[PDB]
Design a protein around this ligand. Structure first.
Ligand SMILES: Nc1ncnc2c1ncn2[C@@H]1O[C@H](COP(=O)(O)OP(=O)(O)O)[C@@H](O)[C@H]1O
Ligand SMILES: Nc1ncnc2c1ncn2[C@@H]1O[C@H](COP(=O)(O)OP(=O)(O)O)[C@@H](O)[C@H]1O
Ligand SMILES: Nc1ncnc2c1ncn2[C@@H]1O[C@H](COP(=O)(O)OP(=O)(O)O)[C@@H](O)[C@H]1O
Ligand SMILES: Nc1ncnc2c1ncn2[C@@H]1O[C@H](COP(=O)(O)OP(=O)(O)O)[C@@H](O)[C@H]1O
Ligand SMILES: [Mg+2]
Ligand SMILES: [Mg+2]
Ligand SMILES: [Mg+2]
Ligand SMILES: [Mg+2]
Lengths: 49, 97, 427, 446, 439, 443
C-alpha cells in the first residue's frame, strides 16, 4: 500500500510506445506495414486533419 | 497514433511468423510407424508399470504443513493473482489426464 | 542371516556402578574407553546440556566405529541417531555448511501426539456445490466438503455404491472398494468388492508418532505430499534442494517451544557421529566452533586415526589428529589402545562363533599368531574362506592345513607390497 | 520462551556497567575485561544514539578470552527493536549466491525500520450473525448486535461482509474484531459474557477474553522490518515465500536504490523510523580478499550498520594472497577499523567463571574440588575445566552423592585427556597412527 | 542526520573560470586534482563525445572516493551515476564480461516525454443486439456516463471496454478513470458521493476527483537502456503459459544477447530523430579496480571502443604490483599496460599536518560537536603520527566520554583516555609480534 | 541516417582508400600509412566478395596502438550491408553456462548468412458487406471492394466458420489469405471513425486499399545460420536469440539443417553468403579452443576468420611454454600473417589533424606541432585523448582556438604512463606493495 500508490502518478507505459516489441512477433507481415505507414501518414489523413 | 502505433513491429526486424512457419515447416509424410513399441512413450511406460508402483510405493512424509501446498503456486483466499486467472488455471489443468 | 564386521557388539556391557568387566557384550579390553563411553551415555541421558563435543582418537583396528555403534545401541531407539562420514558433507546442490546444519537439525527428536479424525462409509450420492452422503454399517451422515477433495474423488474414479476412506485432518482420500451388498452384478467384474465397514462414520483416534526438527523444517519449506493438481504441479517445479533460511529455523523453534510449553510434546536430544573427520575442510572446521557454541546443537562425536598432520584446506599448520587447536580446546579426548595376543585370540574365536563356524584350537593359535604378525582385520576377513575351504572337503571344523592353504591362496598387505617392490612393470 | 537446554554463553546477560560506563568487577554473569567492557559500552551508546553509521570495530586477543562472550553480552544488552545479526566467516561461500551478494544481504538485514499504520478497528462480543439472500427490495438483509462489558449496540452489513463472514463458519457469540480499513475478521475467541454456559469448552479460545466495553477505537500498529525484507518482497511476485525459503537469487540493484530513495522520503514525511542495527562477523580471517575489498566500500555508505569483527590468529597469510599480512587482515582494513584487545585471564577470574558455570549447570562444587578445578584450568585451559566440571557430575551421582568431591575430579581428569598429554602420547606413539605420508604400522609383531 | 565518512562533501567547489579555493564544499587541499576533475565534469556535461576513461592514483586515505562523490554531486541528479567495486563484477549466475555489459548499459540514461489524455463518479452504463451471423449474442454499442467534478459527460464505447470494466468488478455507482490509449481501466474505489450507504462497510471512501471529464497530462520519464532491454527480453502477461512459467521461473538474469542491443539502439535512434527522446550519457565508477582480472581488462578495452560507451572513472592505490590472473606481468596500479595506454592518469598527494587539522575541524563541525583548541591540536599530532582516518574515527568515542561526565566540549584527557582504550594498527601489530600465545 | 553515435574511437574510418586495381591512397576515409597492410586487406576483401572458397585463416600482427583494429573497422565498413560481420573479442568465449567449443560453434554459425525467396498470394482489404440468411451455413456469398476494384465471392461452410471467429461488420476492409491460410483484421473504415468518444488498442481506422486486392507478391528473407538452427532447436526458441539461453544444442539439428540448406541451394530458391568472423584479442584463449578452430577451418561452411593480437613470444593460456606470437605453432602453420609497422611523424600529424577535425575542434598550427611532438615522445593515443581536454580548457579560457598554453596546461594536468611510473618509483613507500606492505605514518 505504501509502495503501490504512486503508480497512478509516475507510471509510464513502455508498451504504448511499442517498446515491448519482442512479444509482438508472431502476428505481422510487412506488405501492409510500409504501405499503411506511408498511406495513412500522408494521403489517408490529409483529408482528415 | 499514426506516428506511434500505425506500423511499428510489422516491419520484420527480429522475425515474422510466416518466416517461422516456412522454417519450422516439415517435409515428412509418414515415418516411424513402430512408434508402437520402438519409441514406447513414457505416458505408456508409467501405466505399463502399474503393478510395481502399487506394490512398492510405501514411504510417506513424516510431516506436512497444510496451506503451503496451495500457496506454492500463489493462489489462496488472500493472494496477488487475478480473479478469473486462478480458476482458469485449474480449468485448463483439471482436464489434464 | 547377514553378518558384516559388526552385530556382535550388543552394547558396552557396563555395570550399573560404572565399572566395566573384561569380556562382556561382545567386547574385550578397552576398559577405560568403555567407562568413558558409559559416562558420556549417562551425560546424554541427562538431557540437560547441549553442544558438547567429544573426540575419540586411536590407531586403526581399535574398534573406534565399533565403540560408536556400541554407544548408539546402548542408548536405544528413543534417542535420534544419524551416522555420518566426513566426505558426505561435500555436495553440489547446497553449500557444505548448510548440509552440516541440516544434519544438525536431524539429530534431535520430538515426541508429539495428535487426534486423527476420519470418515468412512458407503458412497450414496454426490451433489455438486460439495455435499456427500456416507452410509456405515449402522450409521449414516451427510458431509459438506471442499471442492478440492471432490475433484480428487473424481480423479479416483469413485463410482456409486462404493466405500471410501477419508482423513479429515489432511484431506486424504482413499477408496476401499465397493460394498458386497451389491457385488455379483457382473460375472467377471474387475472391481474387487469389499465388505461394508463396521462402526460410526465419524471416528477419533490418538497417535504418538515422533519427528525430528529437520523434518519439520523441510515440511514447512517444501510441501511434498499434495493430492490435487495444483499441489504436485507446483511441487514438481523445483526438484533441486535449496538453502534454508535461519529465520525459518527460528520460527520452527518458536512453534515447538510453544508446543512443549502447552504440554503435548517433549524434546529429545540426540547424538551426531562423524567418522573419519580428518579429511574435513578448514572452513567446515572453523564453522563447527560457531555451530557447537549454540543453545540447541546436540552432542557430537568424532573419529580420526591420525597424528602430526596438516588439516585439509590449508598447507601450513600441523596439528594432532588432523584437528586445529581451536577445535581441540573445546574438545574432550578419549585414548584407544592397541590390542594384544590373547585379546586377538578371543576376538577371533568370538567372530568365528558369531559366524557359526567350528574351529580347532591349534587353528586358533595359528590365526592369533598370524593376526599379531600382520593385523586383526586380515584374519577376521580370511577366516570365512578357511571355513568354505574346509566345507569343500566336507568338514565342519577348521584344520591348520586348511588355514595355511587359504593364507597361500589370499595375500596380505606386506606380502603384496614386497611383491610390488620387486616387480617387472608395477605389478 | 526461548527454548534451550544449556548454552556455552547462557550465563552472560547483557554485559555489566554503571551509568558512568564503569564495569563492575562482577555483574550479570561475567568477570574481568574492564577496558574491553568499557569500550563495548561505548559502542553500545553509539548504537543507541543512532547518529553515526558505517564504523568498523575489531576485537582481538588470544583464543578463549571473552570474545564471543563480549559479542553475546552486547547483543543481550542491546535488547529488542535493534536488529543484531551474528554471522560466521564461512556462511557466505555459497554456490547459489555471490560472496558480495551475501555480504550485501547481511548488511541489509542489519538495518531496522519502524513503521506505523493507522486502522479503524472495531471489536466486541457478538450474539448471532445475520446473513440474508438477494431479494426484490435490495441487495441483502443484515443487522449485527454486538455486546461488550459496558454497552451493546447494533450495526449493518456492507454487501461484501456477508461473503467475508461466510468464508469461515463463524459461530454465533464470539469476540471478533473488524478493521473497516481492511475488513479482516480476527476471531480471537468466543464471547465471554457469562461463563456459566461457557465453563466446559474443552480448552479452546485460551480462556476467551473479557470484553473491553467501548467499540470505536483507532489504535496505531507499529511494525518493525528490515531493508532485506522490503527488497525481497518487491523482487518477486510472492517475495515472502522466497524470504522463508532463501531463493532470492541475486536481487537487482535498481530495486535497492529505489527502496533507499523511497524510505528516505518516508523518513522525511515522518511515516518511517530508522533503527541502526548491528552486524557481527566472527573469525573474519576466513574471509576472502574480494570480501574485504567490497567491505571497504560498503562501509562508507549512509545505510551501513556498525560492524564488529573478532579473530584469533596474528600475522598470518590472508586468504587469496601469498604474503603473511599482520593480524591476518588487509592493511587498509586495519587502517579503517578500530581494534579492541582482550588480555589473558587470572586464576581468580577463572575460578569465578568456573563457579558461575557450576551454579549455572546445577553443579554443587566443594571448595577443594573448586581449587583442583582452578588448578587444572590454569594449567591447561579454561574450557578443559569448564567441560570437566559438567562431566564429573555423572560420576558424582554414579556413587549416589549429589555433591562432587576431589575423587570425582581426579577420575574425570584421568579418564578424559588433555591436548598436551594427548600430543605427548601421540608423539611417543607415532608409529601407531597414520603418518602424513601414509606410513602405518598395523602389525604389532614384526 | 547521520554520516559515514562523507556527505560533508558538497560538490567539487570549483568557481567560474575553473578555479578552486581552499575551503569550500567541505573540501580542502589537492587543488589541481579538483581542477582536473571539474574539467572532466565539463566534458561530461558537454554530452558530445563519449567513450573515454580516466584513472586516478594515490595512497590510502587520500580522498579518491571523496573525489568521485564530488563528481557525482557536481553532475546533479539528472545524469545517471553507477558506483561499483571490482568484486561485484564476479558472479555465479552469468559471465563477468556480461555483468560488465549490464553495468555499462546501466550507466547511460535517457529522458523520454509523452502526453496522455485520460477520462475520469459513473452516471450509468448500458450496452446496445443481433450479430447478423453465427455469433451467439453481443451488443452493438455501449453507452456510459462519468460524473467527475467539472461537469459530467456521457460516453459511447465498444463492448470490449464493457467487458474490461466488468472484469474490474466495479459497481454501477462508482468512480472510474478510463485510459484512452488502450482502454485499460482499474477500480478507483467507492466514491465519496455514495458515503454511508450502509452502517458498516470496507471499501475506500475515494473522494471524487476534482477536474474535467477528460484530462490531459504531460509525463516526463528518465530511464536507462538497461531497463529497456531487460524489459524487452523478460516476458509479461497474465494467465498465458509462459506467464505462469515465468511467474514460477525464478527469473535469473542470463546473458542478454546483442540483438536486443541493436534493436533498442535502432528504436531509440529513430525516436530521438523524431525528437521525442533525449539521450543523457552517464558516468560509471569502478572503485578499487585492482581486484579485476585479465579477461575483464581485455573485454574492457573492447567495450571501451564501443559505440555508446559512457565515460568511466577508475580508482586504485596499488603500485608496482602484478595484475591478478597472471604472474609475469608487473604493471603500475595492477592495470595491464595496454589498458593504461587507453586512458589518462590523475595524481593525488598526501596531506600535511595543517590539512589534517582542517579536516578534523570540518568533521567535528558537521557532527555538531565542540572540540577544545588544545584537544584538536593534539588530535592533529597523532593524525600525522599514525593516520588521518584513525583520528577521524576517534572523535565519536571522545564525544561519548564527554557525555559521560556531562560536558558538551571535548578535553585533552578525554581523548587521551580514548586513545588508550582503542589501539591503532601500529600498536596492535606491536602487541601481536611481542606475544607468543597465538596473538 | 541511423547514426545514433555521439562519436567512435575510430569513426573517421569509412571503408578503404583503394581503387580499381586496389592501390592504397595516401590518405582516404580516416586512414593513413601502412600501405602494405591495406593492400593485403583489400585482397582479402575481394576474396570475401568472391565468395567461392571458404575456410581461410588470416592473422593481423603489430605493436600496440598500431591500428590493427583500424583495418578491421575499415574492411567492415567497406563490405557494408548484406554480409554479416561478427566482431567478437576473446573474453566472451568463457561462459559457465555453455562450453567454449559450443560458443565457438555458435559464433561460426553466426558468421554465415543465407537468403531465401518466398511468394504469397493474398486478397487485401476486400470483404465488403455480409449477407446472412434460409438459415444455417449463411453468408455464402459476399462481395469484396477496394477504392478501385470490386468483386463478388462465394463462401463455403469452412470459410463461414473462419468468418465466425472474430466476426466483423464487413463495412470495413479486411485482408484474408487467398492462399488457403486464415484471416487478418486490418482495421475500421472512415464511416465509423467518428463513432467512439474513447479509444482502445484493438482496432484502428484503416484506409480502403488502392488497386486490386488480389496480389501474389514474392518476398526475400535473409537470416544467418545460427538463428536458423536455434529456431529449430526446440518447439519455439525465438526468445533464445533474445534471452540468450541457447542451451548447448545437440549435434542433430546442425547436420540435418546443413542437408536442408543444401537442398534449398540445389532448388535455387536460397542463396548463401559467406560473411567474415573477426576475433580481436586472440592471445588470451585456451588451447582446446585453438584445436577446435584448427578443425573447424576445414568445414565447408567456414567463414573467413581474421585474428588480431599484439603480444610477442609469451606463454599461452593453457600450457607451460612461451610460444612465439602467443599462439601454438600448429595454428600459425595454417594461417596468413599480415604484419604492421609503426607510425611516422607525418602520419602522426595527419592522424591527429583528422581526429581534431572529427570532433570539430579548431586547432592552432603550433599546438598541433606540440601535440605531434608529444605523440612522438609518448603514445599517439595520449595526444588523441588530450585533444578533447585541451579544447575544454580552451573553452574555459573563453578562446575558441586551442592555444599552445591550453595544451600545455592539459599536459601538466594529466600524468603520462611513463611519468606515473617514475613518480611511483619515487614514492614506493607511499603506495602499497605487492606484499601487502604500505606506510601511512608520515612521522
Ligand atoms: N572389543 C571388541 N569386540 C569386538 N570386536 C572388536 C573389538 N574391538 C575391535 N573390534 C573389531 O575391530 C574392527 C575395527 O573397528 P573400527 O573402529 O570400525 O575400525 P578401526 O578400529 O580401524 O577404526 C571392528 O570391525 C570390530 O568388529
Ligand atoms: N568474562 C567472562 N565471564 C564468563 N565466562 C567467560 C568470560 N570470558 C570467557 N568466558 C568463557 O569462554 C568461552 C568463550 O570463549 P571465547 O573467548 O569466545 O573464544 P574465542 O576467543 O575463540 O572467541 C565461553 O564459553 C565462556 O564461558
Ligand atoms: N580534501 C578533503 N576534504 C575533506 N575530506 C577529505 C579530503 N580528503 C580526504 N578526505 C576524507 O577521506 C575519505 C576518503 O578517503 P580516500 O582518499 O577516498 O581513501 P583512498 O585513498 O583509500 O581511496 C573521505 O571520508 C573524506 O572525508
Ligand atoms: N593507419 C591509421 N589510420 C587511421 N587511424 C589510425 C591508424 N592507426 C591507428 N589509428 C587510430 O588509432 C586508434 C587505436 O588504434 P587500435 O587499432 O586500437 O590500435 P591497436 O592496433 O593497438 O589495436 C583508432 O581509433 C584509430 O583511429
Ligand atoms: Mg574404524
Ligand atoms: Mg569464542
Ligand atoms: Mg578512499
Ligand atoms: Mg600479439
Amino acid at each position: 500500500k505504501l509502495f503501490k500508490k504512486n503508480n497512478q502518478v509516475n507510471r509510464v507505459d513502455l508498451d504504448f510506445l511499442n517498446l515491448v516489441f519482442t512479444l509482438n512477433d508472431k502476428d505481422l507481415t510487412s506488405y501492409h506495414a510500409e504501405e499503411i505507414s506511408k498511406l495513412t501518414c500522408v494521403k489517408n489523413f490529409v483529408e482528415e486533419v | 497514433v499514426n506516428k506511434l502505433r500505425c506500423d511499428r513491429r510489422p516491419i520484420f526486424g527480429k522475425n515474422l511468423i510466416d518466416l517461422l512457419t516456412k522454417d519450422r515447416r516439415v517435409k515428412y509424410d509418414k515415418s516411424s510407424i513402430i512408434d508402437n513399441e520402438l519409441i514406447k512413450p513414457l505416458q505408456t511406460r508409467v501405466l505399463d508399470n502399474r503393478k510395481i508402483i502399487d506394490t512398492f510405493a510405501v514411504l510417506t512424509p513424516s510431516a506436512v504443513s497444510l496451506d503451503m501446498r496451495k500457496l506454492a503456486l500463489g493462489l489462496n483466499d488472500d493472494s496477488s493473482v487475478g480473479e478469473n486467472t486462478r480458476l482458469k488455471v485449474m480449468q485448463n489443468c483439471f482436464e489434464v489426464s | 542371516t547377514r553378518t558384516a564386521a559388526h552385530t556382535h557388539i550388543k552394547g558396552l556391557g557396563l555395570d550399573e556402578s560404572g565399572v566395566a568387566k573384561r569380556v562382556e557384550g561382545g567386547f574385550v579390553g578397552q576398559i577405560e574407553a568403555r567407562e568413558a563411553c558409559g559416562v558420556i551415555v549417562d551425560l546424554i541421558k541427562a538431557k540437560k546440556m547441549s553442544g558438547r563435543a567429544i573426540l575419540l582418537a586411536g590407531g586403526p583396528s581399535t574398534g573406534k566405529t565399533a565403540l560408536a555403534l556400541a554407544i548408539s545401541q546402548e542408548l536405544g531407539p528413543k534417542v535420534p541417531f544419524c551416522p555420518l562420514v566426513g566426505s558426505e558433507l561435500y555436495s553440489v546442490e547446497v553449500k557444505k555448511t548448510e548440509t552440516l546444519m541440516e544434519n544438525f537439525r536431524r539429530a534431535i527428536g520430538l515426541r508429539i501426539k495428535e487426534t486423527k479424525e476420519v470418515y468412512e462409509g458407503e458412497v450414496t450420492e454426490l451433489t455438486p456445490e460439495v455435499i456427500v452422503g456416507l452410509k456405515s454399517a449402522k450409521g449414516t451422515k451427510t458431509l459438506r466438503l471442499d471442492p478440492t477433495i471432490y475433484e480428487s474423488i473424481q480423479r479416483e474414479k469413485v463410482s456409486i455404491g462404493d466405500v471410501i476412506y477419508i482423513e479429515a485432518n489432511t484431506g486424504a482420500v482413499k477408496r476401499v472398494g465397493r460394498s458386497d451388498a451389491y457385488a455379483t452384478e457382473f460375472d467377471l467384474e474387475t472391481e474387487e468388492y469389499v465388505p461394508l465397514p463396521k462402526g460410526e462414520v465419524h471416528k477419533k483416534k490418538e497417535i504418538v508418532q515422533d519427528v525430528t526438527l529437520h523434518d519439520l523444517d523441510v515440511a514447512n519449506a517444501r510441501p511434498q505430499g499434495g493430492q490435487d493438481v495444483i499441489s504436485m504441479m507446483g511441487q514438481l517445479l523445483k526438484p533441486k534442494k535449496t538453502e534454508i533460511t535461519e529465520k525459518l529455523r527460528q520460527e520452527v523453534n518458536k512453534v515447538v517451544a510453544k508446543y512443549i510449553d502447552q504440554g503435548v510434546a517433549e524434546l529429545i536430544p540426540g547424538v551426531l557421529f562423524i567418522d573419519e573427520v580428518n579429511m574435513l575442510d578448514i572452513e567446515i572446521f572453523t564453522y563447527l566452533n560457531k555451530a557447537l557454541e549454540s543453545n540447541i546443537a546436540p552432542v557430537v562425536v568424532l573419529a580420526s586415526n591420525r597424528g602430526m598432520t596438516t588439516v585439509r584446506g590449508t598447507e601450513d599448520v600441523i596439528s594432532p589428529h588432523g584437528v586445529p587447536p581451536d577445535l581441540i580446546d573445546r574438545l574432550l579426548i578419549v585414548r584407544t589402545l592397541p590390542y594384544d595376543k590373547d585379546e586377538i585370540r578371543t576376538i577371533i574365536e568370538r567372530r568365528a562363533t558369531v559366524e557359526r563356524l567350528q574351529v580347532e584350537s591349534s587353528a586358533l593359535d595359528l590365526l592369533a599368531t598370524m593376526g599379531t604378525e600382520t593385523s586383526l582385520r586380515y584374519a577376521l576377513q580370511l577366516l570365512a574362506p578357511c571355513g568354505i575351504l574346509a566345507q569343500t572337503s566336507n568338514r565342519k571344523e577348521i584344520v591348520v592345513n586348511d588355514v595355511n592353504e587359504a593364507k597361500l591362496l589370499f595375500l596380505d598387505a606386506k606380502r603384496s607390497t614386497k611383491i610390488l617392490e620387486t616387480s617387472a612393470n608395477y605389478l | 520462551k526461548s527454548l534451550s537446554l544449556i548454552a556455552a554463553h547462557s550465563h552472560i546477560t547483557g554485559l555489566g556497567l554503571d551509568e558512568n560506563l564503569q564495569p563492575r568487577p562482577t555483574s550479570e554473569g561475567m568477570v574481568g575485561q574492564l577496558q574491553a567492557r568499557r569500550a563495548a559500552g561505548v559502542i553500545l551508546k553509539m548504537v543507541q544514539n543512532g547518529t553515526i553509521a558505517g564504523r568498523a570495530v575489531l576485537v582481538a586477543g588470544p583464543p578463549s578470552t571473552g570474545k564471543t562472550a563480549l559479542a553475546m553480552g552486547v547483543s543481550q544488552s542491546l535488547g529488542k527493536d535493534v536488529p543484531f545479526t551474528a554471522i560466521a566467516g564461512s556462511e557466505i561461500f555459497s554456490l547459489e549466491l555471490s560472496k558480495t551478494e551475501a555480504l550485501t544481504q547481511a548488511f541489509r538485514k542489519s538495518i531496522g525500520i519502524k513503521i506505523k499504520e493507522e486502522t479503524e478497528l472495531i471489536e466486541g462480543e457478538v450474539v448471532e450473525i445475520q446473513i440474508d439472500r438477494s431479494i426484490t427490495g435490495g441487495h441483502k438483509q443484515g443487522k449485527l448486535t454486538i455486546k461488550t462489558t459496558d454497552m451493546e449496540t447494533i450495526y449493518e452489513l456492507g454487501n461484501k461482509m456477508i461473503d467475508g463472514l461466510t468464508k469461515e463458519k463463524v459461530l454465533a457469540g464470539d469476540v471478533i474484531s473488524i478493521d473497516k480499513a481492511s475488513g479482516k475478521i480476527t476471531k480471537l475467541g468466543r464471547s465471554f459474557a457469562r461463563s456459566r454456559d461457557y465453563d466446559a469448552m474443552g480448552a479452546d479460545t485460551r480462556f476467551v477474553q473479557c470484553p473491553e466495553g467501548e467499540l470505536q477505537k483507532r489504535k496505531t500498529v507499529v511494525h518493525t522490518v528490515s531493508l532485506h525484507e522490503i527488497d525481497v518482497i518487491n523482487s518477486r511476485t510472492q517475495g515472502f515465500l522466497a524470504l522463508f525459503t532463501g531463493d532470492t537469487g541475486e536481487i537487482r540493484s535498481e530495486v535497492r536504490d529505489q527502496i533507499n530513495t523511497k524510505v528516505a522520503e518516508w523518513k522525511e514525511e515522518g511515516k518511517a523510523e530508522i533503527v541502526p542495527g548491528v552486524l557481527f562477523i566472527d573469525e573474519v580471517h576466513m574471509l576472502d580478499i574480494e570480501c574485504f575489498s567490497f567491505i571497504n566500500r560498503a562501509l562508507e555508505d549512509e545505510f551501513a550498520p556498525i560492524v564488529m569483527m573478532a579473530t584469533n590468529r596474528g600475522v598470518s597469510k590472508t586468504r587469496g594472497t601469498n604474503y603473511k599480512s599482520p593480524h591476518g587482515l588487509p592493511l587498509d582494513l586495519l587502517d579503517r577499523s578500530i581494534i579492541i584487545t582482550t588480555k589473558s585471564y587470572n586464576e581468580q577470574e577463572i575460578k569465578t567463571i568456573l563457579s558461575i558455570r557450576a551454579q549455572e549447570e546445577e553443579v554443587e562444587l566443594s571448595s577443594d574440588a573448586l581449587d583442583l578445578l582452578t588448578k587444572t584450568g590454569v594449567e591447561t585451559s579454561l574450557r578443559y575445566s569448564s567441560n570437566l566440571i559438567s562431566v564429573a557430575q555423572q560420576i558424582a551421582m554414579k556413587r549416589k552423592n549429589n555433591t562432587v568431591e576431589v575423587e570425582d575430579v581426579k577420575r574425570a581428569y584421568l579418564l578424559f585427556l588433555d591436548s598436551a598429554r594427548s600430543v605427548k602420547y601421540v608423539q611417543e606413539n607415532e608409529s601407531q597412527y597414520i603418518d602424513d605420508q601414509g606410513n602405518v604400522q598395523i602389525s604389532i609383531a614384526k
